Ligand SMILES: *Cc1c(COP(=O)(O)O)cnc(C)c1O
């Protein structure tokens with residue numbers, strides 16, 4: 026069936042509400058968790074996820090990751106920017122591996138580190154971690170095809186420049202452009218908060234959906250229960266395929 | 267005569283490496299990317315981020331394109347070849363044929379159409395020389411919308427002819443730095459004699475549009491513009507095909523990079539031609555002294571960070587040069603292509619380009635824009651190398667505008 030990939034900022038809004046939300050997400054149909062590691066520069070993140078990083082400022086993520094890992098059976102991908110760790114990449118990956126995370130998604134790998142794609146992807150695979158590779162309409166068709174053969178678990182394809190911000194964009198047409206290039210599962214994300222925006226991608230070929238900002242917005246507007254709600258709704262929609 | 271394309275071509279899907287996306291600055295107080303949805307007409311913004319290889323040209327836009335004289339002529343410059351005693355054949359796509367006198371009309375027309383279709387009824391933009399201001403004033407007139415042009419102050423004073431045409435089409439023209447925007451008055455506070463820059467004029471145009479709920483039209487740099495301009499390169503291929511010709515060297519001049527990318531990208535994406543020479547000013551050395559970094563297109567920093575060769579957003583052009591190409595950065599796609607070695611770059615100084623223009627005036631006949639004489643200059647140097655190599659090189663270049671409203675410039679260059 027379709028993959029529902031749920032993003033949340035580590036520790037957001039606080040450690041015990043975060044734990045609450047995650048557990049609820051997993052119980053209500055989240056297939057994969059992507060958990061944000063507060064970066065120095067959230068290059069490709071909209072204002073909502075950037076603010077969510079400010080709120081958790083100071084968080085000690087490692088004991089927390091170990092708590093989550095203990096109970097959650099689903100794959101968990103750390104999400105963070107390579108620029109912040111490239112100088113300590115081996116230790117970073119080894120710590121990601123220590124706390125028993127499944128893999129990593131460096132949003133700026135292809136975009137700002139294309140010359141090191143093969144090297145870094147080997148380092149990650151070599152340590153037994155899934156390298157979830159990130160792409161977008163900014164990546165040329167040939168390269169999309171190439172990384173679709175090596176990305177682990179699924180290939181991520183963001184349809185908008187930055188998370189959260191609803192840039193006008195034809196999702197149906199961006200998916201058709203790439204559907205036959207991606208020899209992988211194809212998970213679509215960035216601004217997919219409306220059923221219409223979400224059903225468009227499913228019916229256009231996508232094997233899954235990735236959603237983050239709308240959950241944080243929900244947590245901030247109405248709270249964690251009301252947000253776990255939203256997961257159920259989204260799981261339902263994907264379940265129609 | 268439907269050599270006129272059915273589609274616009276976007277090179278992005280065919281680039282050698284990924285094109286870094288526009289970007290909110292680190293720890294910014296407001297999202298630039300989110301602000302775009304107020305700045306740009308919705309459909310312009312959608313074309314800027316819904317990146318496909320081909321995008322149908324709406325039939326009404328094709329109709330308007332036809333009415334201004336598209337496809338532009340593809341001339342062979344046989345007198346010029348004979349003067350250079352070159353074995354190469356020399357062709358130029360003559361973008362000066364449109365009513366405004368330059369290629370800028372190719373993007374003003376669709377942008378204005380999309381704004382009128384969205385219910386906009388007043389557009390705003392900046393201009394330096396006035397080629398873009400004039401395009402936008404004509405395009406606004408076509409669709410019965412008001413236009414406000416923020417013209418770089420020093421150009422406003424030395425170029426009253428273009429002001430006449432903009433006002434003739436129905437535009438209002440202010441001299442940036444003006445005191446009609448917050449960013450304007452700030453710049454007047456610190457140095458009220460400031461002669462302006464494209465970056466400053468861009469920012470006031472954007473600020474002024476926001477303050478009044480107007481829309482802003484963008485004349486270069488962004489991909490949606492070079493997408494629209496790809497009518498230039500697509501016609502050229504078709505027109506060379508009709509001649510049984512195959513381009514070897516493709517030459518264009520580079521301000522922000524729209525006429526070059528409109529001209530060469532259909533050639534680069536499909537694997538036609540070989541050797542692309544972007545030509546720029548030595549007095550605004552984007553290529554020789556510029557820096558390939560994320561930086562703002564405008565000086566206020568109201569647009570997202572964009573990855574480009576740039577002299578810096580707050581660059582101020584030289585005080586006496588009269589040859590144009592004064593914008594401080596290069597389009598991200600063009601910056602990528604030249605950093606990746608796919609496009610060659612070349613800078614010329616004012617005397618060299620001024621001599622190039624006189625050669626062209628005296629051995630072809632069209633008065634070229636000072637901008638375009640940068641390209642002519644490289645065309646001439648290559649025609650001479652094809653000599654001392656004896657090969658039938660076909661040099662196609664893009665004559666991006668005529669110079670009839672730049673005669674004050676040519677007078678200034680009688681000082682060399
Ligand atoms: C504005 C202009 C240019 C430089 O801008 P580009 O975006 O590179 O086209 C070149 N030639 C003419 C005639 C212009 O008006």
Ligand SMILES: O=P(O)(O)OC[C@@H](O)CO
Pocket residue numbers: 032059070074187188189190214215216217218235236237238239
């Ligand atoms: O749905 P989005 O736009 O908030 O995407 C969240 C990202 O950080 C990862 O999916």
